[PDB]
Structure 1
Amino acid sequence: AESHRLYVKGKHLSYQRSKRVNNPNVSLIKIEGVATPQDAQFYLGKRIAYVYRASKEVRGSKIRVMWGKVTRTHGNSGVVRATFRNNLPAKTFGASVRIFLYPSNI
């Protein structure tokens, strides 16, 4: 109980985009340990959270969370696509993100 994590780590790389136009509506996530679209199929539909600090407390907390979910895979190397209730801020390209194991249809 050194470890308590029940999510897989991921990184927020980019919005969906062509060379010169981006689409903030979809985000591209690289899930740790996932190297192929075949592997990434496991994570589709799972929930993600981006988790951040703020100065103003809300429900007596300075931690905040943006939720979303993995929607399809992306390209040939396990990258995955994700939509969020809001839209990841963009300063967060490179930030860590958390990919849960539910909804589980193990």
Structure 2
Amino acid sequence: AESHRLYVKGKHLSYQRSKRVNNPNVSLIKIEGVATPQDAQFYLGKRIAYVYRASKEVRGSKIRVMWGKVTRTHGNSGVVRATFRNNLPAKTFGASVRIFLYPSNI
């Protein structure tokens, strides 16, 4: 067990946006391994996490999480949309993100 991971690796690409206006309220996620919308249907509803470090300890922890779920497909190539409880920081475009296998219907 070098591997401990129960999630698929994601990147945070963008807020939903037109050429010149963005919607912070939706994030565009790129799920690793997913080429097409047909695939990306698998992950809809499944919970995402962005995990970051801080300085101030909270729950005895310097690590934090922003939670949300994959909600609908995006475009033709497996990009998918997502909302989080709060809204990702935009510094995080191109940051890693985590997509879990629950809620499951397998």
- TM-score scaled by length of structure 1: 1.00
Aligned to 1:56: 56
Q: Deviations over 1:68-93 (max 9, x none)?
A: 00000000000000000000010000
- CA-CA distance at 1:23 after TM superposition: 0.2
Give 5+ residue unaligned stretches, structure 2: none
Q: How many angstroms apart in 1 are the aligned matches of 2:78 and 2:95?
A: 18
Aligned residues: 106
- CA-CA distance at 1:42 after TM superposition: 0.2
Q: Deviations over 1:15-69 (max 9, x none)?
A: 0000000000000000000000000000000000000000000010000000000
Aligned to 1:95: 95
- CA-CA distance at 1:104 after TM superposition: 0.3
Aligned to 2:37: 37
Q: How many angstroms apart in 1 are the aligned matches of 2:53 and 2:5?
A: 19
Give 5+ residue unaligned stretches, structure 1: none
- SS of the residue 1:26 aligns to: strand
Q: What percentage of aligned pairs have identical amino acids? A: 100
